[PDB]
Design a protein around this ligand. Structure first.
Ligand SMILES: CCCCCCCCCCCCO[C@@H]1O[C@H](CO)[C@@H](O[C@H]2O[C@H](CO)[C@H](O)[C@H](O)[C@H]2O)[C@@H](O)[C@H]1O
Lengths: 1044, 53, 54
């Protein structure tokens, strides 16, 4: 401890090592947007090309969910049976579980159920990929001269880049905006009835004609003597051109007229699938959509992945301009850049304070040395503890500035005081001083960890955000305290100019001397007064109860939130076209919006990316989505040039005057959950009453909740209802006499209207698919059921019109399940005056009042709240009792801690007030803001009572006498740190621009904390301490005692 | 699993046992394998050897 | 682990038919449960025994 004050060089060495280890361990420290906070997600996606909804639900999904048993730390399993042939099963795992162990466990349980799968799937792969629950980044590509089609650009993507983007050590599924090329054979049904051939014949044709073949070797092994040859037997090779595919032979006519493929059908290199149309400002574009990583940091996933893309960028052709719609990157750089700004500001500010009080340059250098060294290495505590420097962690640093600045100030100050009163040379004056506050600083360390370690113990995703803070600010504390024990004191016995007893400046030299007199006269007023207050016990007690009680009202009347919403420079708006609408209508809308934003928001919007085909959880024709990138924040001044107002008037325009649901919105800040107080209610069918009963129970319920505006808000189902589906019921009999084989009839209907994956070919040196689907006009209106004939066993064709019964029922375009059984998702929010759990008990009562076989469950954000809920108070019970007995040890008593801990209402009711004043809210930034506030309030309070009791005892002085003296000499510092600080948080409190939601939420809560904290504590504490103490035995007196 | 008075047969019960539960006990994070005492329904078609001859 | 299976079961329990009742043949649980309540008993007895001796 002290050992260093007469060892500046050993002290320096601990200091220098810490700086170098810190800053140099800074140069290679990871940088992200936020650290991976969210419970890890895996997706199994599969493609059943052309299937129906109840098909991919009942053939692939239900066949996995029986054998998708045996994965470790699994929390829940959700699945979507798209009527696009896609099934998507996302398994969400227990937070902090081994990600990869989970994901791999999943794929070796894919193969217990895999052989007994459909064969159209088994042949079309299934991809299991560890994934976020949202897109991390999207890089767009467009063509300059526009002379490329979606499908062309898309091919290029697939030809030079998208092989490793799913291989970066942090990427699950990438949704490619486009499609890689496939050999597209478009069957003409007339020109097929013409030549006595049907689809079936086209298939077996192209299968057989297009392959590699089991070769062999000339001079094969084992040869015989003399042999002098080994050379490669090549065989038939799969095809390559458009020529090879037109010239495909199907049957030879008796006259010699060969019947080729080119005759019967159209042949072009086409898109492998035409679900989605993606328009970047209308101009055709293909992009890559990257889902965030199960655990990676941002500028580095981006450094390695942009390593990929910048590795493919020098070799791109002209006519092709790379474009940039949405990342989470420049955002981060300017944000942290902002936090470095504020920290730096805080040094120049403190030194401002420090000079304007201590007026000795050489005293102003001292704490200036303090903070760099403690931060620089504070980083080291992180980097070695495996965390990363993103947004929020840095907010733990700038937020820690308070207890750091206090540390240095408290110490250097007391040196100044002892030398101002006794004339001692520095070195000795320091020894006596450090001797005045030592125990105090170990105590502060204790109690601080007492308030801050329990935050790391939060559970869940919330647990993770809190952890980032615990660790940063606790670490900032640890290094600051050790500094305050080795270099900080050792700098004093080494750097400060010696002051003779009692000069105190007063008047000596204007600007300042006028200042010091002003201060002294003031402070004595302060003391003459404080004692004045000590004469009156009762009054101030009452007033206290008040203040707490007020703090209580004020806390209650502030509604929770989870994190602030940010102009992220980027947002999205959603589209939903009425049931059964077609691509034509949806694309009409996307065109409408794209025009709107790019016109009547001429100053702000730079780019819209309209995605036609998927909006809600799955893909589908009725659905559209548009991604808006904006111009730099700097060029969108006011409030109306912000996400708030833009989204507002967009949705104004699109909500109330359209035939399609058009909502504009922005996601919360974090790439994951917590859209405030709400839910994701799952009504699971349990008895087995099939899709209909579930549909109606959910409707009954959805109307049942619209009937309580005094508990719920926006009770909406999220998903798709039951759309018109068209049964072609086959009368097997009529076909069983007639000499036609059913197998062929099916596979024909299929390859006609769905399509068929048949073989693979080699374009330009890279493999692609072989697809034979009907042509355009021969499968769009019900009437085409007729135009297709199947060739029977005899040799004559047959109408579908001979056996095709045809009717109209309903089916859902999305058959969903939750936890292995069929279910339905009612998404929601709590009414403006509600906690979510309130809604939770009431929903529990509504879904209780539903038929026996409709059960209920919670997922996602609303999964969190089933775990514990009312325990944050319990961790504060822990934080509390521990900070207390830590005080019962520093003060070797029980009552004296009551005296110091009673200061916390004072710090908060002021912290509450300001957040309440502006428009702010009880979130994280305010919660951490609060704790840090709790801390300085309690620190300062600690010094007051420790110096007084020291006098009382070991200087034998009296209660009133000493508390007044202590209060007297250690006042001036309270105000210094306070004033240095309040001014530091100040700008953040203001701030417009990037993270101003953050800056404001923290800064404001904290500052309001600071005012009331000091101007209340410096008057309250002595009343705590004397009046807390005014309950014990001996004379005391006030003034006694007599000793040494 | 049992029925109190009037019995249902092994397979009846068994079906219920296997059809609504053995889906989640074996997917619960913390379970090895389950061995079901009985067996789940399957479509039982029993061929007639005379009537097929 | 029983709490997790019984989580499953407390959720499959409302949707049941008549006569259909859960029973328990092989339970290595009550042995453990009453065993610890018992080692606790002796432990505390050891304390009361001790304090009395002293
Ligand atoms: C941001 C700007 C605004 C900041 C607001 C700060 C206000 C905080 C309140 C502090 C008030 C201190 O006031 C001081 O103490 C006590 C009571 O207070 C009074 O003093 C009197 O009270 C008692 C009552 O018997 C005694 O008789 C005492 O001898 C007498 O001095 C005041 O005349 C004054 O000496």
């Amino acid at each position: 401890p002290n050992f260093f004050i007469d060892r500046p060089i050993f002290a320096w060495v601990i200091a220098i090592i810490i700086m170098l280890a810190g800053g140099l361990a800074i140069l290679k420290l990871p940088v992200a947007q936020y650290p991976t906070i969210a419970p890890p997600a895996v997706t199994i996606s599969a493609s059943y090309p052309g299937a129906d909804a109840k098909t991919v639900q009942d053939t692939v999904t239900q066949v996995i969910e029986q054998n998708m048993n045996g994965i470790d730390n699994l929390m829940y399993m959700s699945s979507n049976s798209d009527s696009t042939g896609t099934v998507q099963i996302t398994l969400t795992f227990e937070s902090g579980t081994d990600a990869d162990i989970a994901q791999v466990q999943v794929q070796n349980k894919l193969q217990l159920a895999m052989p007994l799968l459909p064969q159209e799937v088994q042949q079309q792969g299934v991809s299991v990929e560890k994934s976020s629950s949202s897109f991390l980044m999207v890089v767009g590509v467009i063509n300059t001269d526009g002379t490329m089609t979606q499908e062309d650009i898309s091919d290029y993507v697939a030809a030079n880049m998208k092989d490793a983007i799913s291989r970066t050590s942090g990427v699950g599924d990438v949704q490619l905006f486009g499609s890689q090329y496939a050999m597209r054979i478009w069957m003409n049904p007339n020109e097929l009835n013409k030549f006595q051939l049907t689809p079936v014949d086209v298939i077996t044709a192209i299968k057989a004609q297009n392959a590699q073949v089991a070769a062999g070797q000339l001079g094969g092994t084992p040869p015989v003597k003399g042999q002098q040859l080994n050379a490669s037997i090549i065989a038939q090779t799969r095809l390559t051109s458009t020529e090879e595919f037109g010239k495909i032979l199907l049957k030879v006519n008796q006259d010699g007229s060969r019947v080729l493929l080119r005759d019967v059908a159209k042949i072009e290199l086409g898109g492998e699938n035409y679900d989605i149309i993606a328009e970047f400002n209308g101009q055709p574009a293909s992009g890559l959509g990257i889902k965030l990583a199960t655990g990676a940091n941002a500028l580095d996933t981006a450094a390695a992945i942009r390593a990929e893309l910048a590795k493919m960028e020098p070799f791109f052709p002209s006519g092709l301009k790379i474009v940039y719609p949405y990342d989470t990157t420049p955002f981060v750089k300017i944000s942290i850049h902002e936090v470095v700004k504020t920290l730096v500001e805080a040094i120049i500010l403190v030194f401002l304070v420090m000079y304007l009080f201590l007026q000795n340059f050489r005293a102003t250098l001292i704490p200036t040395i303090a903070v760099p060294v403690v931060l620089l290495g504070t980083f080291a505590v992180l980097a070695a503890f495996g965390f990363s420097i993103n947004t929020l962690t840095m907010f733990g640093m700038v937020l820690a500035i308070g207890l750091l600045v206090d540390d240095a100030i408290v110490v250097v100050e007391n040196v100044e005081r002892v030398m101002a009163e006794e004339g001692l040379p520095p070195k000795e004056a320091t020894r006596k001083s450090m001797g005045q506050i030592q125990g105090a600083l170990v105590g502060i360390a204790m109690v601080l960890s007492a308030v801050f370690v329990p935050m790391a113990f939060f559970g869940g995703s919330t647990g993770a955000i809190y952890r980032q803070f615990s660790i940063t600010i606790v670490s900032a504390m640890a290094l600051s305290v050790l500094v305050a024990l080795i270099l900080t004191p050792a700098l004093c016995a080494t750097m400060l100019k010696p002051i003779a007893k009692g000069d105190h400046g007063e008047g000596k030299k204007g600007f300042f001397g006028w200042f010091n007199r002003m201060f002294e006269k003031s402070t004595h007023h302060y003391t003459d007064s404080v004692g004045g207050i000590l004469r009156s016990t009762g009054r101030y007690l009452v007033l206290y109860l008040i203040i707490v009680v007020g703090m209580a009202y004020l806390f209650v009347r502030l509604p929770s939130s989870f994190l602030p919403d940010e102009d992220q420079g980027v947002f999205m708006t959603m589209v939903q076209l009425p049931a059964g609408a077609t691509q034509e209508r949806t694309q009409k809308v996307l065109n409408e919006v794209t025009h709107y934003y790019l016109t009547k928001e001429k100053n702000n919007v730079e780019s819209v990316f309209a995605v036609n085909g998927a909006g809600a959880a799955g893909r589908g024709q009725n659905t559209g989505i548009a991604f808006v990138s904006l111009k730099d924040w700097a060029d969108r001044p006011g409030e109306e040039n912000k996400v708030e107002a833009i989204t507002m008037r967009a949705t104004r325009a699109f909500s109330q005057i359209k035939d399609a649901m058009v909502f504009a919105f922005n996601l919360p800040a974090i790439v994951e959950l917590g859209t405030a107080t709400g839910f994701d209610f799952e009504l699971i069918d349990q008895a087995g009453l099939g899709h209909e009963k579930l549909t109606q129970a959910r409707n009954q319920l959805l109307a049942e909740a619209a009937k309580h505006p005094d508990m719920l808000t926006s009770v909406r189902p999220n998903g798709l209802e039951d759309t018109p589906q068209f049964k072609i019921d086959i009368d097997q009999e009529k076909a069983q006499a007639l000499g036609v084989s059913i197998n062929d009839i099916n596979t024909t209907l299929g390859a006609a209207w769905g399509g068929s994956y048949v073989n693979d070919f080699i374009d330009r040196g890279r493999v692609k698919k072989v697809y034979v689907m009907s042509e355009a006009k021969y499968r769009m209106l019900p009437d085409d059921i007729g135009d297709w004939y199947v060739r029977a066993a005899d040799g004559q064709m047959v109408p579908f019109s001979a056996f095709s019964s045809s009717r109209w029922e309903y089916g859902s375009p999305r058959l969903e399940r939750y936890n292995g059984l069929p279910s339905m998702e009612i998404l929601g929010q709590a009414a403006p005056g509600k906690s979510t759990g309130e809604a939770m008990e009431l929903m529990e009562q509504l879904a209780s009042k539903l038929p026996t076989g409709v059960g209920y469950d919670w997922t996602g954000m609303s999964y969190q709240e089933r775990l514990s809920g009312n325990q944050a108070p319990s961790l504060y019970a822990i934080s509390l009792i521990v900070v207390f007995l830590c005080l019962a040890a520093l003060y070797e008593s029980w009552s004296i801690p009551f005296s110091v801990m009673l200061v916390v209402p004072l710090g908060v009711i002021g912290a509450l007030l300001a957040a309440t004043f502006r428009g702010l809210t009880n979130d994280v930034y305010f919660q951490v803001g609060l704790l840090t506030t709790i801390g300085l309030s309690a620190k300062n309070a600690i010094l007051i009572v420790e110096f007084a009791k020291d006098l009382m005892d070991k200087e034998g002085k009296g209660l009133i006498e000493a508390t007044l003296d202590a209060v007297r000499m250690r006042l001036r510092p309270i105000l210094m740190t306070s004033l240095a600080f309040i001014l530091g948080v100040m700008p953040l409190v203001i701030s417009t621009g990037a993270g101003s939601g953050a800056q404001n939420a923290v800064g404001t809560g904290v500052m309001g904390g600071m005012v009331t904290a000091t101007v209340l504590a410096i008057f309250f504490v002595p009343v705590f301490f004397v009046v807390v103490r005014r309950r014990f035995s001996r004379k005391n007196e006030d003034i006694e005692h007599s000793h040494t």
